Swiss-Prot record:
Disulfide bond sites: none
Organism (species): Chaetomium thermophilum (strain DSM 1495 / CBS 144.50 / IMI 039719)
Listed name of the protein: Nucleoporin NUP192
Known function: Functions as a component of the nuclear pore complex (NPC). NPC components, collectively referred to as nucleoporins (NUPs), can play the role of both NPC structural components and of docking or interaction partners for transiently associated nuclear transport factors. NUP192 is located to the NPC core at the nuclear membrane and is essential for de novo assembly of NPCs.
Cell compartment(s), UniProt: Nucleus, Nuclear pore complex
Domain of life: Eukaryota
Subunit structure as annotated in this protein's UniProt entry: Component of the nuclear pore complex (NPC). NPC constitutes the exclusive means of nucleocytoplasmic transport. NPCs allow the passive diffusion of ions and small molecules and the active, nuclear transport receptor-mediated bidirectional transport of macromolecules such as proteins, RNAs, ribonucleoparticles (RNPs), and ribosomal subunits across the nuclear envelope. Due to its 8-fold rotational symmetry, all subunits are present with 8 copies or multiples thereof. Part of a tetrameric NUP192-NUP170-NIC96-NUP53 module.
Protein family membership: Belongs to the NUP186/NUP192/NUP205 family.
Length: 273
């Protein structure tokens, strides 16, 4: 019955494309659009997703611009709403789909050189991740999510690796180090390993989602960051620290899985001869 909210969704898209207003007003627009795109999913279910995707693509790049350059602007409260909206826009666009999805949103973001700046941001991800000026935690999270979603498709993974992913990851130094060699300690390790899981998933996703071309790239990622993969593969009082530990080893388990997926998906062992 969310058809009365549709015309609201339309008004929001209009204002945004126009870009008239304080970012405070566009934060409101982004929030409304986020809730509409997430309150729709949960020949009639596809027709609605069709009406929506149609509403978005109507304004074209003119719309994706305003939302993108807010995701990288001064106002922090705004860039969070913007990054979340984008993450939601590339989700309802895949939901409108057969694996040969040719997403017009992902294609648009690449055409706006937004995936480029997105990957480049990873160079300072570590400092950006451990610090609460500085962008929000919900923002950085929304960014890693967007990255992971782009890589779960063929064209998207291509765009991300074409924007030099492995390079920015090497420059971030997030992997070329050890985590335990560094607020409680267990919390610090849950946090760090959390970041490692995210990025490790983005790498595995980009490698599997292509073919044979990037097998070399992921292979080199493992070799160069070996020792960490092997260190990971090798394995207050009673209220928060018991859960803190429970969480830490769970994030370490997740990371171990990601590495194993990136190993079999190369495959590293065959290489190791």
């Amino acid at each position: 019955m969310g058809d009365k909210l549709f015309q609201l969704f339309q008004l929001c898209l209009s204002a945004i494309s126009q870009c008239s207003g304080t970012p405070e007003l566009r934060s409101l627009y982004y929030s409304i659009c986020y809730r509409y795109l997430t309150a729709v999913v949960d020949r009639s279910v596809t027709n609605a997703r069709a009406r929506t995707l149609k509403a978005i693509t109507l304004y074209g790049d003119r719309l994706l611009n305003v939302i993108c350059d807010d995701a990288y602007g001064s106002d922090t409260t705004c860039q969070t709403a913007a990054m979340i909206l984008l993450n939601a826009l590339v989700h309802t666009s895949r939901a409108s789909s057969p694996a040969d999805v040719d997403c017009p949103i992902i294609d648009a973001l690449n055409r706006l050189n937004f995936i480029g700046v997105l990957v480049d941001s990873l160079k300072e991800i570590l400092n950006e991740w451990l610090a609460p000026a500085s962008p929000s935690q919900q923002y950085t999270s929304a960014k890693l999510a967007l990255l992971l979603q782009l890589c779960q498709t063929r064209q998207g993974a291509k765009y991300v690796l074409q924007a030099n992913l492995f390079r920015a990851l090497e420059q971030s130094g997030v992997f070329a180090a050890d985590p335990e060699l560094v607020v409680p300690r267990v919390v610090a390790l849950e946090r760090h390993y959390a970041l490692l899981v995210a990025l490790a998933r983005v790498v595995g996703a980009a490698v599997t989602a292509r073919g044979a071309h990037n097998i070399v790239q992921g292979r080199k990622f493992l070799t160069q960051h070996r020792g960490l993969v092997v260190h990971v593969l090798k394995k207050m009082t009673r209220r928060d620290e018991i859960l803190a530990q429970q969480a830490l080893e769970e994030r370490i388990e997740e990371l171990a899985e990601a590495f194993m997926l990136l190993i079999t998906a190369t495959g590293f062992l065959e290489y190791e001869s």
